[PDB]
Amino acid sequence: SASALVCLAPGSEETEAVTTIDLLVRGGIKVTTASVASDGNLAITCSRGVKLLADAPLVEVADGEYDVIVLPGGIKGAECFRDSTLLVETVKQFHRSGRIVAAICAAPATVLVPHDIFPIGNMTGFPTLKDKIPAEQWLDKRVVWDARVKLLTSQGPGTAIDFGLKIIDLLVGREKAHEVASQLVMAAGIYNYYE
């Protein structure tokens, strides 16, 4: 029953987006990808040229019943998100309605901080952009989950597995996260949800 709205824009980071989508599907989460292209185009060219088809334009699915909204990074993709009134309103509405906001890489500093969506809360993002996250909020962790504000953040292409697994934990739980992790041949430095 859990569901995720994964946003995509021209210049989104394709490893971040695709890894996350794949993991969520493996976790039994229904995924809808939403284009935030300004014209509604669904055929998105990502930051390294990968061409990815979104399922729907954001305006058609933003009001949907999703448990989490996911913001991939990629500098130009994140700038598109920042500059989209609809995207920002949608993020705010997920937060205000008690749902989860998940953002990786460039997205925290580029989207969340300028719009002051989370004035209180811990967050991370891509490390070269750490001076764009307020110092009292920054943590240098692969994933940061601040349950007080239901904000999940993560750092870069290489933390996309950690990020996706944490979304699975938050939507479906530890058993499913561990199950998905066990499928991947993941590196020892990524938490695998069993103790």
Contact residues for a copy of itself, defined by CB under 8 A? 13-15, 18-19, 21-23, 25-26, 31, 43, 46-53, 126-127, 142, 155-159, 161-162, 183-190
Question: Catalytic annotation on 105?
Answer: yes
Q: Are 23 and 165 in contact (CB under 8 A)?
A: yes
User: How many residues of this chain interact with Mg ion, rule: CB under 5 A?
Assistant: 2
Task: Identify what 49 binds: a copy of itself, Mg ion, none; CB under 5 to 8 Å per kind.
Answer: a copy of itself
Least separation in angstroms between residue 87's CB and a copy of itself is: 21
Q: Kindly state the DSSP code that residue 46 receives in the 8-state scheme.
A: -
Note whether 28 binds Mg ion by CB under 5 A.
Answer: no
- Name the residue nearer to Mg ion (CB basis): 78 or 123: 123
- Name the residue nearer to Mg ion (CB basis): 119 or 173: 119
Instruction: Draw the binding track, 102-141, toward Mg ion (x: CB under 5 A; -: no contact).
Output: -----------------x--------------x-------
Closest by CA to 141, choosing from 118, 169, 122, 157, is 122
Least separation in angstroms between residue 126's CB and a copy of itself is: 7
Residue 52 CB neighbour total at 10 angstroms: 17
The C-alpha angle with vertex 80 and arms to 78 and 86, in degrees rounded to 5, equals 110
Least separation in angstroms between residue 176's CB and a copy of itself is: 15
What are the distances in angstroms from CA 7 to CA 120, 131, 136, 158?
A: 24, 25, 28, 19
The C-alpha angle with vertex 52 and arms to 47 and 125, in degrees rounded to 5, equals 45
- Name the residue nearer to Mg ion (CB basis): 40 or 119: 119
Sign of CA dihedral 17, 155, 69, 73: negative
Residues contributing to the site for Mg ion (CB under 5 A): 119, 134
